Amino acid sequence: ALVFFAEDAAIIGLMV
Amino acid sequence: ALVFFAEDAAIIGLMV
Amino acid sequence: ALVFFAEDAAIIGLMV
Amino acid sequence: ALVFFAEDAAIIGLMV
Amino acid sequence: ALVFFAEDAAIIGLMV
Amino acid sequence: ALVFFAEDAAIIGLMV
Amino acid sequence: ALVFFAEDAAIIGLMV
Amino acid sequence: ALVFFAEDAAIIGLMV
Amino acid sequence: ALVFFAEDAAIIGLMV
Amino acid sequence: ALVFFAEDAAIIGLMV
Amino acid sequence: ALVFFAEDAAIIGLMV
Amino acid sequence: ALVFFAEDAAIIGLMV
């Protein structure tokens, strides 16, 4: 699965 | 909101 | 075109 | 992370 | 299917 | 434009 | 609702 | 950034 | 496949 | 139009 | 929730 | 990368 990154602060992973 | 990153060059934020 | 990034390991581009 | 809502009935969260 | 909601005014369903 | 809603806390609009 | 357009050939609407 | 187009009526831009 | 269009400037296709 | 598939049970089409 | 399928190899579910 | 499937006919891959 791919992991995208976003600033939520702190950077968080978004797993797909 | 979430801020994603993309190369547009320069790295820009993409807010959601 | 925009280029997003994801961890796939190694970081890969994703062009739009 | 954002939580979107959808009817699945009952309403469910969708966490991003 | 999932039914999301959006303001279009009136709140409409968006089926998936 | 459509306006979607998400919990972010508090509920926020997301315009499209 | 929003109507996007795409070539499918022929150009079609895509309603959201 | 990319600018997509949709009928909303009138044709509007959608900037990404 | 579907071909969407966006201004990038110049109008480009985006194939799906 | 493209038709994607999802388990909803039973597998359903999703046309685009 | 809908389950989409993708090849990651092996087929994996993607739950929405 | 992930490869999704859609009916386009024939079943085609859609790589991400």
How big is the G-H interface in CB pairs under 8 Å?
14
Q: Residues J4, J14: contact at Cβ < 8 Å? A: yes
Measured CB to CB, residues of chain L less than 8 Å from chain A are 1-2, 16
Residue B8 distance to chain H (closest CA, Å): 6
Tell me if residue F8 falls in helix, strand or coil.
Answer: coil
Radius of gyration, alpha carbons of chain C:
8
Q: How far is Cα K15 from Cα K1, in angstroms, rounded to an integer?
A: 6
Technique used: X-ray
Q: Could you give the CA distance from residue I4 to residue G2 in angstroms, rounded to a whole number?
A: 14
D11 neighbors D5 (Cβ within 8 angstroms): yes
List chains adjacent to chain F, taking adjacency as at least 3 C-beta pairs closer than 8 Å: B, D, E, G, H
What is the full DSSP assignment across G1-16? --EEEEE---EEEEE-
Q: Say yes or no for a CB contact (<8 Å) between G5 and I3.
A: no
User: Measured in whole angstroms, how far is the alpha carbon of residue E5 from the centre of its chain?
Assistant: 3
Query: What sign does the CA torsion over I14, J15, J6, E6 have?
Result: positive
Chain C hits for I8, Cβ within 8 Å = 1
Chain-centroid distance, C-alpha H16: 10
Instruction: Tell which residue, A14, B1, E4, has the closest CA to residue D5.
Output: E4
Task: Give resolution, Å, one decimal.
Answer: 2.0
Q: Name the phi and psi angles at C6, rounded to 5.
A: -145, 145
DSSP designation for I7: E
- At CA G6, angle to CA H15 and CA I6, rounded to 5? 30
Of I16, J12, H14, B1, the closest CA to residue L15 belongs to I16
Rounded to 5°, angle at Cα E7 from D16 and H5: 80
> Which one, of G2, G6, F16, H4, lies nearest residue I6 by Cα?
H4
CA distances from residue K16 to C10, D14, E11 in whole angstroms, order as listed: 26, 7, 22
* C-alpha span between J13 and E11 (Å, rounded): 25
Give the burial string for G1-16 (b: 16+ CB within 10 Å, else e): ebebbbeeeeeeeeee
Q: Report how far apart, in Å, the C-alpha atoms of A3 and of each of C10, H2, K15 are.
A: 10, 23, 15
